[PDB]
Amino acid sequence: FSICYADTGLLGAHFVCDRMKIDDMMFVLQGQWMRLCTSATESEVARGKNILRNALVSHLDGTTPVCED
Amino acid sequence: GREFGNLTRIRHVISYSLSPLEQRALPHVLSKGVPNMLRRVRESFFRVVPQFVVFYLLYTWGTEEFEKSKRKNPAAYENDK
Protein backbone atom coordinates (compact mmCIF):
# COMPACT_ATOMS: atom_id res chain seq x y z
CA PHE A 1 0.00 0.00 0.00
CA SER A 2 0.73 3.69 -0.45
CA ILE A 3 -1.23 6.25 1.59
CA CYS A 4 -0.67 9.87 0.60
CA TYR A 5 -1.17 13.11 2.47
CA ALA A 6 -0.32 16.75 1.68
CA ASP A 7 3.31 16.67 2.88
CA THR A 8 3.88 13.05 3.90
CA GLY A 9 2.62 9.50 3.60
CA LEU A 10 2.97 5.84 4.47
CA LEU A 11 4.53 3.28 2.11
CA GLY A 12 4.44 -0.32 3.21
CA ALA A 13 2.72 -3.67 3.55
CA HIS A 14 0.13 -5.54 5.59
CA PHE A 15 -0.34 -9.25 6.21
CA VAL A 16 -2.01 -11.98 8.23
CA CYS A 17 -0.21 -15.12 9.40
CA ASP A 18 -0.42 -18.18 11.54
CA ARG A 19 1.53 -17.49 14.72
CA MET A 20 4.40 -19.87 13.81
CA LYS A 21 5.08 -18.20 10.43
CA ILE A 22 5.56 -14.51 11.18
CA ASP A 23 9.37 -14.54 11.03
CA ASP A 24 9.72 -16.22 7.63
CA MET A 25 7.13 -13.85 6.16
CA MET A 26 8.95 -10.76 7.43
CA PHE A 27 12.16 -12.21 5.98
CA VAL A 28 10.55 -12.74 2.57
CA LEU A 29 9.06 -9.24 2.48
CA GLN A 30 12.23 -7.39 3.45
CA GLY A 31 14.21 -9.53 1.02
CA GLN A 32 11.98 -8.47 -1.86
CA TRP A 33 12.49 -4.84 -0.84
CA MET A 34 16.28 -5.21 -0.86
CA ARG A 35 16.07 -7.03 -4.20
CA LEU A 36 14.22 -4.15 -5.84
CA CYS A 37 16.60 -1.59 -4.38
CA THR A 38 19.71 -3.40 -5.62
CA SER A 39 18.89 -5.80 -8.46
CA ALA A 40 15.84 -4.84 -10.48
CA THR A 41 15.56 -5.79 -14.16
CA GLU A 42 13.59 -4.58 -17.17
CA SER A 43 11.40 -7.63 -17.73
CA GLU A 44 9.51 -7.40 -14.42
CA VAL A 45 9.23 -3.58 -14.54
CA ALA A 46 7.42 -3.93 -17.88
CA ARG A 47 4.86 -6.22 -16.26
CA GLY A 48 4.34 -3.80 -13.38
CA LYS A 49 3.76 -0.91 -15.77
CA ASN A 50 1.09 -2.95 -17.55
CA ILE A 51 -0.62 -3.84 -14.28
CA LEU A 52 -0.65 -0.15 -13.34
CA ARG A 53 -2.14 0.83 -16.72
CA ASN A 54 -4.91 -1.73 -16.28
CA ALA A 55 -5.70 -0.51 -12.76
CA LEU A 56 -5.93 3.16 -13.74
CA VAL A 57 -8.31 2.50 -16.61
CA SER A 58 -10.39 -0.07 -14.68
CA HIS A 59 -11.12 2.25 -11.76
CA LEU A 60 -12.87 4.98 -13.79
CA ASP A 61 -15.98 3.02 -14.75
CA GLY A 62 -19.35 4.63 -14.11
CA THR A 63 -20.25 8.14 -13.02
CA THR A 64 -19.68 7.86 -9.25
CA PRO A 65 -15.92 7.02 -9.41
CA VAL A 66 -15.42 9.74 -12.03
CA CYS A 67 -17.20 12.45 -10.02
CA GLU A 68 -15.17 11.32 -6.99
CA ASP A 69 -11.93 11.57 -8.97
CA GLY B 1 11.51 -27.24 21.40
CA ARG B 2 11.64 -23.86 23.10
CA GLU B 3 10.96 -21.37 20.31
CA PHE B 4 9.53 -17.86 20.02
CA GLY B 5 6.27 -19.17 18.59
CA ASN B 6 4.75 -20.98 21.59
CA LEU B 7 6.42 -20.02 24.88
CA THR B 8 3.36 -18.95 26.90
CA ARG B 9 -0.20 -17.60 26.73
CA ILE B 10 -0.82 -13.87 27.33
CA ARG B 11 -3.77 -11.52 26.71
CA HIS B 12 -4.30 -7.75 26.69
CA VAL B 13 -0.78 -6.32 27.14
CA ILE B 14 0.32 -3.31 25.05
CA SER B 15 3.91 -2.20 24.44
CA TYR B 16 5.50 0.94 23.00
CA SER B 17 9.03 1.53 21.73
CA LEU B 18 11.21 4.07 19.93
CA SER B 19 14.06 3.36 17.57
CA PRO B 20 17.62 3.74 18.90
CA LEU B 21 18.39 6.52 16.41
CA GLU B 22 15.48 8.61 17.74
CA GLN B 23 16.73 8.78 21.35
CA ARG B 24 19.83 9.34 23.48
CA ALA B 25 22.10 6.59 24.80
CA LEU B 26 22.93 8.25 28.16
CA PRO B 27 19.90 10.49 28.70
CA HIS B 28 20.04 11.47 32.41
CA VAL B 29 23.00 10.37 34.54
CA LEU B 30 23.53 12.89 37.35
CA SER B 31 19.84 13.72 37.82
CA LYS B 32 18.55 10.13 37.92
CA GLY B 33 21.32 7.52 37.82
CA VAL B 34 23.45 8.76 40.72
CA PRO B 35 20.62 8.86 43.34
CA ASN B 36 19.47 5.43 42.15
CA MET B 37 22.94 3.98 42.71
CA LEU B 38 22.93 5.61 46.14
CA ARG B 39 19.68 3.95 47.22
CA ARG B 40 20.88 0.68 45.68
CA VAL B 41 23.91 0.87 47.97
CA ARG B 42 21.70 1.78 50.94
CA GLU B 43 19.42 -1.23 50.48
CA SER B 44 22.27 -3.77 50.80
CA PHE B 45 24.82 -2.11 53.10
CA PHE B 46 23.96 -3.85 56.38
CA ARG B 47 23.49 -7.28 54.76
CA VAL B 48 27.08 -7.47 53.44
CA VAL B 49 29.49 -5.11 55.23
CA PRO B 50 29.56 -6.15 58.92
CA GLN B 51 30.74 -9.70 58.16
CA PHE B 52 33.77 -8.29 56.33
CA VAL B 53 34.44 -5.86 59.19
CA VAL B 54 34.53 -8.85 61.56
CA PHE B 55 36.94 -10.62 59.20
CA TYR B 56 39.22 -7.57 59.31
CA LEU B 57 39.24 -7.50 63.11
CA LEU B 58 40.04 -11.22 63.27
CA TYR B 59 42.88 -10.87 60.76
CA THR B 60 44.55 -7.99 62.59
CA TRP B 61 44.19 -9.68 65.98
CA GLY B 62 45.73 -12.93 64.78
CA THR B 63 48.65 -11.13 63.15
CA GLU B 64 49.41 -9.11 66.29
CA GLU B 65 49.24 -12.22 68.49
CA PHE B 66 51.56 -14.24 66.25
CA GLU B 67 54.06 -11.39 66.22
CA LYS B 68 54.00 -11.04 70.01
CA SER B 69 54.70 -14.76 70.34
CA LYS B 70 58.15 -14.34 68.73
CA ARG B 71 59.60 -11.86 71.27
CA LYS B 72 61.78 -13.02 74.15
CA ASN B 73 60.21 -13.24 77.61
CA PRO B 74 62.38 -11.59 80.30
CA ALA B 75 61.16 -14.00 82.98
CA ALA B 76 62.71 -16.86 80.98
CA TYR B 77 66.17 -15.74 82.19
CA GLU B 78 65.56 -13.38 85.12
CA ASN B 79 63.49 -15.59 87.39
CA ASP B 80 65.84 -18.11 89.03
CA LYS B 81 69.49 -17.03 88.50
UniProtKB/TrEMBL annotation, chain B:
Signal peptide: none
GO biological process terms held by the UniProt record: cerebellar Purkinje cell layer development; hippocampus development; hypothalamus development; midbrain development; mitochondrial electron transport, ubiquinol to cytochrome c; pons development; pyramidal neuron development; subthalamus development
The protein's name in its UniProt record: Cytochrome b-c1 complex subunit 8
Matching InterPro entries: Cyt_bc1_su8, Cyt_bc1_su8_sf
Membrane topology field: Single-pass membrane protein
Role this protein plays: Component of the ubiquinol-cytochrome c oxidoreductase, a multisubunit transmembrane complex that is part of the mitochondrial electron transport chain which drives oxidative phosphorylation. The complex plays an important role in the uptake of multiple carbon sources present in different host niches.
Keyword Cell inner membrane appears in the UniProt entry: no
Quaternary structure (record): Component of the ubiquinol-cytochrome c oxidoreductase (cytochrome b-c1 complex, complex III, CIII), a multisubunit enzyme composed of 11 subunits. The complex is composed of 3 respiratory subunits cytochrome b, cytochrome c1 and Rieske protein UQCRFS1, 2 core protein subunits UQCRC1/QCR1 and UQCRC2/QCR2, and 6 low-molecular weight protein subunits UQCRH/QCR6, UQCRB/QCR7, UQCRQ/QCR8, UQCR10/QCR9, UQCR11/QCR10 and subunit 9, the cleavage product of Rieske protein UQCRFS1.
Keywords of this entry: Electron transport, Membrane, Mitochondrion, Mitochondrion inner membrane, Respiratory chain, Transmembrane, Transmembrane helix, Transport
Protein source organism: Chlorocebus sabaeus (Green monkey)
